[PDB]
RNA sequence: UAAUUGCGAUAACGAACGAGACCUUAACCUACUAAAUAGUGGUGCUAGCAUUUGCUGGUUAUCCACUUCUUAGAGGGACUAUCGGUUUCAAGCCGAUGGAAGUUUGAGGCAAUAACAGGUCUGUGAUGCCCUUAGACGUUCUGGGCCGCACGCGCGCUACACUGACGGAGCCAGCGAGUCUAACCUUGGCCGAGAGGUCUUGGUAAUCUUGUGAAACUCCGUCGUGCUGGGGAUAGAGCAUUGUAAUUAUUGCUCUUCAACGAGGAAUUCCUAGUAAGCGCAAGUCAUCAGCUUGCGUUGAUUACGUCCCUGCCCUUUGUACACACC
């Protein structure tokens, strides 16, 4: 019966890795509002981080805050496995890490980068605007954007 | 927009309202106030604690409450 | 080879979006 | 009510309100009774059942339909549109969650209510379609006690599903309000709606 | 030894539900639990159905062993509500009576859902040029 | 009831029309317990065209 | 030795159509006609006991455009 | 307002050149000595009873 | 006077046993048990985080209880489901085994079943009694 | 729509003629006596036509039939 | 009448094909023959709960009995029966009673006479003619292409959410398939979040996979009118299975990116009962790959039981200069 008052404990909009977490929404769901968490991962930091899930964003601590933002700079540490990781075993790096926030369009650009430096098939399609997988484009993607 | 934390005050509304309607559902406390449904849903184990509200049918998809005794 | 390719203009997606559809593509009767 | 056991449980619940006498989910048949002549013998609540749903069969003969209970029909005409055909078991929650509902809105008898909105809900002169000579007319027909049955359930099982639609409220709620408009002529019920339309169109071309 | 113990089933779609009726103490069980458990849920009384029109009083001496095999949810249901009753009147007709028998025939038929009477709906075969055994494809013409 | 579900038209042409043949096939065993040579016999004072027979020893 | 092949002779050769086949085969290929070729044939089958007879020979007869003519005599069923 | 009852006499034949309506007559339920025919939009039976609205009119064959 | 799990409740008594279960401290609930689906169909996480493994484990004490001898594969069966495709049609997809058969292997260690002939497990006499017992329990709910 | 062809009536129309006083209204019995004095290949035609000499009969005895 | 199906009318009489009959399959059988590859009853041996004898399991066979459910052989079964109402009171149609079944009992196989310059020479070691025959239009080998993308039409998939989504738990089908000079259906144990893996295993099969413990569904919850956790396109990153070979992503798995879509204009398809619709499953294809077909069962209705308004067809009548027949 979590029939909760309290009377400034609770705030909406707290920034978290330069983003805009809205405060009513659900923890696990309020922190998805970053990008490079999803569900998934968003479920599963909060876990590790000793925080209660049936809170509100608006709700936890600022040291809760704290161990949640840590968490999510290395995963790899809070015994979250390489899998749950989207960059793993990096192209020019070789360890495995999981980026966050700005640094998402970041890599990604690199990437098609590389194979636009390297200038091949799948990086040439990116580049073109076209599909890069094997799909049909007689038919489809139309009316573009 | 509505309420998801309980605002004390309108936690006063709550138990000073709620023998008001003789129909208090899942959705009742949702218009008639402005919870957040997820509130309201646990509104009901509340006012079922020593319940201010009597119950008659119970479900996962419904609740149907009447109103004191 | 690639290096004609993806450095080659008039040849993209924009110069083909650019391009007004041929009028006989919505035309049969033989 | 002189309650036996044996050597499987049976609960006193069941024993009582049962063998004393066939209640609907737990609400009485008797001492309701359709308050309209003509659509008796059509909106049927007579024979006495426990549960909206039988496997009966009621498309052989023409008019088999009605021998059926209005209570089941009014359930069946709940699963509709795709996404709900063949859930019969869903409506019959559904269902008897609704006369729960209504029973607590105004005390009374909500097999009843039922009742009082498939009666007064039910055209009794509509609208044909004549050749007219082109740009053709209309003509004000009267309609069948068996269509003052059919298209009363039409229009409300299309009264508390298109309300409940994007909206915060459960079928069995809004086929509660849905029912209880149209159990007294209230207008704020979508069937009423637009039956007092459509005898409006009929005095119109005559 | 070998007990006076009538045999019926009945079915419903695919559904077979095998009975068995002896000479008991009063158990009713469908599977291998009481038939106050059989939570299909809404069906509830579509099974307790059997046990009302006719009085309980009758199934004080009787020993039920019902079983459902195939169909759905659904259909183990009727096929079961069927088979109860399908040995009900089944042991008065060979240990009983044939008089008061005939109360239990006219208890049921006189409100019958399938009751002691199979409703014979099978399926319809689905034929080629469509999904359905009558629903077509959809044809395009120009 | 061995099934096989094939279009008419050799080529595509006209109205998708599928046609299907069976084949049946009936299986039974007898069993029975006998001597020397009322086994070698049956098998010979039994015999018919079209008809599969074979008799089995016992036991794995 | 573990595979005989026998040979019979025939259930009179009204009976089977298979042999009135290659038949009309040799007729033809003996430089004939269509209706006295044909018209043979039947007669043999209908003076064979049979209930009735149909020979139909489709392609070209006459040259040019392909044609076919049936010639058939006697009782035949069809349908069930 | 006058409401008419009247319970089906004979059903004639079929009107309406689509073919959805259909000729009927009734007994007007407190008067006996009555006989009229009009016209109906749903499946009607002999027996049953309708509810007439401007309690006249009496039509013929329809389009 | 004389109460088997074939009388209760399969809502009711794997709620309880559920209970029973963790609070009897030693169940052996492995290291992840926080990071699995229970299968490859379901989208998110089971989400009483807490004790599922408990109930999971609890279902399948009823489950080889009601029964002979089930094996790992069919557990990962009945409880794997339908199962969103993207865009396409849905198909039934199994589910985890390193979850189910680890349930079997520490139901062992407790006592509530064992390693069949035949294949897989069966249910254990000196877990047949612990059912039967906190079955009753349940039975006995009436206060 | 139950129309008994000709194969059938051809030969209610038969068995009338022929065996009258070996018959009677019943359904059954009458059915019985045709694979007596008659051949029928089908059992289900058997039956067709038994119900129809069957059906004549009763209007045989209500006033003679054209013939 | 569904029918040139019949009653009848009759310068026609009496017949043959077609429709009907017939064959298949789905419905009834406490009646016949049987069953360790199908089941149940008792009985040993054996486990739990109460110890009230009992409720519940285990033993592929301990012993014996039986054929209700199961399998398929042999027949029984229905004839629109019984009564009533209508109509030349004839063929019939309607209604109520019984009955497993009373819309050709439901659904199919088959199916005449005549016709088409419909389609197939790319199924054929079916075939005429022309072509072509070693710089081969024969063949085989390597790589590429059939998928190439400003766009117009067709069939389909998933969706817009609360009658929902997600998480637990509940738990029920039928049609089917499966390894000899091999490698198919695969339980079980173990390993791995997964997809998989590895060690054994049953089955040439009512015997083993399999009770195909399918899905929709049911319950208890979480979420709460928010383009929201509805929706899952696009894309990056990693791991796996098939195959000689995966790039122009085969497929699967895990995380991350989270677009359009807020019920669809003029227009249009299909449908009358276990049908529509929703649901998933086997089989075809198959090394691999279904959003496709062919079938199966689960859940299961609103409406109709009518008409010629429309669009097609058929019959009769009438016009004709058409007969290569209103292209
Ligand atoms: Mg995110
Ligand atoms: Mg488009
Ligand atoms: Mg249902
Ligand atoms: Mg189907
Ligand atoms: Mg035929
Ligand atoms: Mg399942
Ligand atoms: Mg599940
Ligand atoms: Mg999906
Ligand atoms: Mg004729
Ligand atoms: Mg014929
Ligand atoms: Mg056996
Ligand atoms: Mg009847
Ligand atoms: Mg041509
Ligand atoms: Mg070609
Ligand atoms: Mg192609
Ligand atoms: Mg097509
Ligand atoms: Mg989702
Ligand atoms: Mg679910
Ligand atoms: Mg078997
Ligand atoms: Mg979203
Ligand atoms: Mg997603
Ligand atoms: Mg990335
Ligand atoms: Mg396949
Ligand atoms: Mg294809
Ligand atoms: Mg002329």
New binding site residues.
């Given amino acids: 019966s979590?029939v909760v008052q309290e009377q400034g404990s609770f705030q909406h909009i707290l920034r978290l890795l330069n983003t805009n977490v809205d405060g009513?929404?659900?923890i696990?769901?309020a922190l998805?509002?970053?990008?490079?968490?999803?569900?998934?991962?968003?479920?599963?930091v909060c876990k590790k981080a000793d925080v209660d899930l049936?809170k509100?964003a608006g709700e936890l601590t600022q040291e809760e805050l704290e161990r949640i933002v840590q968490i999510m700079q290395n995963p790899t540490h809070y015994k979250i496995?390489?899998?749950?990781?989207?960059?793993?075993?990096?192209?020019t790096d070789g360890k495995d890490?999981?980026?966050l926030a700005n640094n998402?369009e970041s890599?990604?650009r690199?990437?098609?980068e590389?194979?636009k430096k390297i200038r091949?098939?799948?990086?040439?399609?990116?580049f073109?605007?076209?599909?890069?997988?094997?799909?049909?484009?007689?038919?489809?993607?139309?009316?573009?954007? | 927009?509505?309420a998801?934390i309980l605002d004390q005050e309108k936690y006063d509304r709550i138990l000073k309202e709620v023998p008001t309607y003789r129909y208090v559902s899942?959705?009742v406390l949702?218009d008639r106030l402005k919870?957040?449904?997820?509130?309201?849903?646990?509104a009901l184990?509340h006012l079922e604690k020593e319940g201010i509200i009597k119950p008659i049918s119970?479900?996962?998809?419904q609740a149907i409450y009447t109103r004191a005794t | 080879g690639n290096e004609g390719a993806i450095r080659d203009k008039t040849a993209?997606?924009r110069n083909?979006?650019?391009?007004?559809?041929?009028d006989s593509?919505?035309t049969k009767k033989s | 009510f002189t309650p036996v056991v044996l050597?499987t449980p049976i609960p006193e619940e069941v024993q009582q309100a049962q063998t004393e006498i066939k209640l609907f989910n737990k609400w009485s048949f008797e001492e309701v009774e359709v308050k309209d002549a003509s659509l008796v013998d059509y909106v049927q609540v007579r024979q006495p059942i426990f549960v909206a749903?039988?496997?009966?069969?009621?498309?052989?003969?023409?008019?088999?339909?009605a021998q059926?209970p209005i209570i089941?029909?009014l359930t069946?005409?709940?699963?509709?549109?795709?996404?709900?055909?063949?859930?019969?078991?869903?409506?019959?929650?559904?269902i008897k969650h609704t006369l729960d509902i209504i029973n607590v809105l105004t005390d009374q008898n909500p097999i009843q209510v039922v009742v009082d909105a498939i009666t007064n809900t039910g055209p009794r002169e509509d609208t044909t379609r004549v050749?007219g000579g082109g740009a053709a007319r209309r003509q004000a027909v009267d309609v069948?006690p068996?269509?003052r049955?059919?298209?009363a359930?039409?229009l409300l099982?299309?009264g508390?599903?298109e309300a409940?639609?994007?909206?915060?409220?459960?079928?069995?709620?809004?086929?509660a309000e849905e029912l209880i408009n149209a159990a007294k002529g209230s207008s704020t019920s979508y069937a009423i709606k637009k039956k007092d339309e459509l005898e409006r169109v009929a005095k119109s071309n005559r | 030894?070998?007990?006076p113990?009538?045999?019926?089933?009945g079915?419903?779609?695919?559904?077979?539900?095998?009975?068995?009726v002896?000479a008991?103490?009063g158990?009713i069980?469908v599977?291998?639990?009481?038939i106050t458990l059989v939570?299909?849920?809404?069906?509830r009384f579509k099974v307790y159905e059997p046990l009302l029109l006719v009085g309980l009083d009758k199934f004080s001496n009787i020993?039920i062993?019902v079983?459902?095999?195939?169909?759905?949810?659904?259909?183990?249901?009727?096929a079961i509500r069927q088979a109860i009753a399908?040995?009900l009147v089944?042991y008065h007709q060979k240990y009983v009576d044939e008089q008061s028998k005939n109360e239990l025939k006219k208890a049921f038929?006189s409100y019958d859902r399938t009751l002691l009477?199979?409703?014979?709906?099978?399926?319809?075969?689905?034929?080629?040029?469509?999904?359905?055994?009558?629903?077509?494809?959809?044809?395009?013409?120009? | 009831?061995?099934?096989?579900?094939?279009?008419?038209?050799?080529?595509?042409?006209?109205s998708?029309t599928?046609?299907?043949y069976?084949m049946?096939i009936?299986?039974?065993?007898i069993?029975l317990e006998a001597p020397v040579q009322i086994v070698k016999r049956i098998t010979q004072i039994t015999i018919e065209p079209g008809v599969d027979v074979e008799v089995v020893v016992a036991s794995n | 030795g573990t595979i005989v092949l026998y040979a019979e002779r025939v259930q009179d050769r009204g009976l089977s159509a298979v042999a009135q086949a290659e038949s009309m085969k040799f007729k033809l290929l003996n430089g004939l006609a269509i209706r006295r070729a044909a018209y043979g044939v039947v007669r043999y089958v209908m003076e064979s006991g049979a209930k009735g007879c149909?020979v139909v020979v489709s392609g070209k007869l006459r040259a040019?455009?392909?044609?076919?003519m049936?010639f058939?005599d006697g009782?035949?069923?069809?349908?069930? | 307002t006058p409401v008419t009852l009247a319970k089906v006499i004979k059903v004639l034949?079929?009107?309406?050149?689509?073919?959805?309506v259909?000729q009927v007559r009734v007994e007007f339920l407190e008067d006996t000595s009555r006989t009229i025919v009009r016209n109906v939009k749903?499946?009607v039976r002999e027996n049953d009873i309708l509810v007439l609205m401007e309690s006249e009119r009496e039509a013929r064959r329809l389009? | 006077?004389?109460?088997?799990?074939?009388?209760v409740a399969?809502?009711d008594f794997?709620?309880a046993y559920?209970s029973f279960l963790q609070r009897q401290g030693k169940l052996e609930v492995?290291g992840?048990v926080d990071?699995?689906?229970?299968?490859?169909?379901?989208?998110?996480?089971?989400?009483?985080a807490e004790g599922?493994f408990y109930?999971?484990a609890?279902?399948?004490a009823?489950?080889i209880?009601?029964?002979?001898?089930?094996?790992?594969?069919?557990?990962?069966?009945?409880?794997?489901?339908?199962?969103?495709?993207?865009?396409?049609?849905?198909?039934?997809?199994?589910?985890?085994?390193?979850?189910?058969?680890?349930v079997?292997?520490a139901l062992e260690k407790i006592g509530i079943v064992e390693?069949?002939?035949?294949?897989?497990?069966?249910?254990?006499?000196?877990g047949?009694?612990?059912?039967?017992?906190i079955?009753?329990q349940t039975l006995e709910e009436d206060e | 729509?139950?129309?008994?062809?000709?194969?059938?009536?051809?030969a209610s129309?038969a068995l009338i003629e022929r065996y009258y006083p070996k018959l009677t209204?019943?359904?059954?019995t009458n059915?019985?006596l045709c694979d007596e004095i008659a051949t029928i290949?089908?059992?289900?035609?058997?039956?067709?036509?038994?119900?129809?000499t069957?059906?004549?009969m009763?209007?045989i005895q209500?006033?003679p039939?054209?013939?």
Avoid at chain 5, 5 to 9: A, E, H, L, N, P
Avoid at chain 9, 1 to 7: F, H, Y
Avoid at chain 10, 25 to 28: A, E, I, S, T
Wanted: glycine fraction near 10%; charge should be positive.
């Fill in positions: 979590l009513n929404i659900k696990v769901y998805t509002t970053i990008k490079g968490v999803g569900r998934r991962y968003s479920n599963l049936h509100r496995p390489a899998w749950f990781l989207n960059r793993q075993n990096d192209i890490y999981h980026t998402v890599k990604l690199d990437d098609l590389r194979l091949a098939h799948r990086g040439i399609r990116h073109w605007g076209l599909r890069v997988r094997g799909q049909h484009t007689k038919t489809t993607g139309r009316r573009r954007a | 927009q509505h998801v899942v959705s949702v919870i957040g449904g997820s509130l309201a849903r646990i184990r119970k479900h996962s998809k | 993209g997606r083909n979006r650019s391009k007004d559809v041929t593509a919505t | 050597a749903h039988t496997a009966g069969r009621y498309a052989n003969k023409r008019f088999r339909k059926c089941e029909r069946n005409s709940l699963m509709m549109n795709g996404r709900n055909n063949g859930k019969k078991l869903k409506a019959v929650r559904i050749g069948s068996l269509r049955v059919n298209q359930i039409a099982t299309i508390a599903r409940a639609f994007r909206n915060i409220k459960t079928i069995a709620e809004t086929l | 030894s070998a007990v113990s009538v045999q019926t089933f079915k419903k779609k695919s559904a077979t539900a095998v009975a068995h002896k008991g103490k158990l069980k599977n291998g639990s009481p939570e299909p849920e809404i069906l020993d062993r079983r459902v095999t195939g169909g759905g949810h659904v259909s183990q249901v009727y399908k040995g089944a038929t009477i199979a409703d014979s709906r099978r399926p319809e075969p689905k034929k080629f040029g469509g999904k359905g055994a009558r629903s077509r494809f959809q044809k395009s013409y120009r | 009831v061995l099934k096989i579900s094939t279009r008419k038209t050799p080529n595509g042409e006209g998708k599928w046609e299907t069976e049946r009936h299986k039974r065993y069993d | 149909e040019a455009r392909a044609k076919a049936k058939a009782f035949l069923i069809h349908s069930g | 034949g079929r009107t309406g050149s689509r073919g959805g259909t749903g499946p389009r | 006077p004389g109460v088997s799990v074939r009388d399969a809502q794997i709620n559920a492995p992840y990071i699995v689906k229970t299968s490859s169909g379901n989208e998110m996480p089971p989400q009483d599922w109930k999971r609890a279902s399948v009823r489950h209880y009601m029964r002979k001898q089930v094996g790992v594969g069919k557990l990962n069966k009945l409880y794997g489901g339908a199962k969103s495709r993207g865009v396409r049609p849905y198909k039934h997809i199994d589910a985890s085994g390193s979850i189910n058969r680890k079997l292997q390693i069949s002939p035949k294949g897989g497990r069966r249910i254990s006499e000196n047949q009694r612990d059912l039967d017992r079955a009753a | 729509g139950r129309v008994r062809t000709k194969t059938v009536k051809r129309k209204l019943d359904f059954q059915k019985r290949q089908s059992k289900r035609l058997r039956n067709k036509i038994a119900g129809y069957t059906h004549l009763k209007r209500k006033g039939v054209r013939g």
